[PDB]
Structure formats: C-alpha cells, structure tokens
Coordinates of C-alpha atoms in Angstrom, one line a residue:
Chain A
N1 CA 3.1 -50.7 -0.5
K2 CA 0.9 -53.2 -2.4
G3 CA -2.5 -54.5 -1.8
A4 CA -5.6 -56.3 -3.1
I5 CA -9.1 -56.2 -2.0
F6 CA -11.7 -58.6 -3.6
Chain B
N1 CA -15.0 -56.8 1.5
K2 CA -13.0 -53.7 2.5
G3 CA -9.3 -53.2 3.2
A4 CA -6.4 -50.7 3.4
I5 CA -2.8 -51.2 2.9
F6 CA -0.4 -48.3 3.6
Chain C
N1 CA -15.7 -54.2 -2.4
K2 CA -13.6 -51.1 -1.6
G3 CA -9.8 -50.7 -1.1
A4 CA -7.0 -48.3 -0.8
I5 CA -3.3 -48.8 -1.2
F6 CA -1.0 -45.9 -0.4
Chain D
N1 CA 2.4 -48.3 -4.6
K2 CA 0.3 -50.7 -6.4
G3 CA -3.2 -52.1 -5.8
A4 CA -6.2 -53.8 -7.2
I5 CA -9.9 -53.7 -6.1
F6 CA -12.3 -56.1 -7.8
Chain E
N1 CA 1.3 -39.6 9.4
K2 CA -0.8 -42.1 7.5
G3 CA -4.3 -43.4 8.1
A4 CA -7.5 -45.3 6.8
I5 CA -11.0 -45.2 7.8
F6 CA -13.5 -47.6 6.2
Chain F
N1 CA 0.6 -37.2 5.3
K2 CA -1.6 -39.7 3.4
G3 CA -5.0 -41.0 4.0
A4 CA -8.1 -42.8 2.7
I5 CA -11.6 -42.8 3.7
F6 CA -14.2 -45.0 2.2
Chain G
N1 CA -13.2 -67.7 -8.3
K2 CA -11.2 -64.9 -7.4
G3 CA -7.4 -64.1 -6.7
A4 CA -4.6 -61.6 -6.5
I5 CA -0.9 -62.2 -6.9
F6 CA 1.5 -59.3 -6.2
Chain H
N1 CA -13.8 -65.3 -12.4
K2 CA -11.8 -62.3 -11.6
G3 CA -8.1 -61.7 -10.8
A4 CA -5.3 -59.2 -10.5
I5 CA -1.5 -59.8 -11.0
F6 CA 0.8 -56.8 -10.3

C-alpha cells in the first residue's frame, strides 16, 4: 500500500 | 487534510 | 496535514 | 508500504 | 483486520 | 491486525 | 504548489 | 513548494 496526504 | 491508505 | 499508510 | 505526509 | 480513525 | 488513529 | 508521485 | 516522490 502507498499513499500521500498533503 | 487527513487521509489513510491501508 | 496528517496521514497513515499501512 | 510507503507514504508521505507534508 | 485493518482500520483507520481520524 | 493493523490500525491508525490520528 | 504541492504534489505527490508514487 | 513541497513534494514527495516514492
């Protein structure tokens, strides 16, 4: 799993 | 902003 | 911003 | 798993 | 089981 | 089991 | 500007 | 500017 929060 | 990836 | 990836 | 928060 | 609360 | 709370 | 590539 | 690549 991969994610970005920005 | 807030997030979850799983 | 806050996030979790797992 | 990989993630970025910024 | 997996979960996120935010 | 895996989880995040934030 | 902000971005994520993954 | 801010970014993540992964």
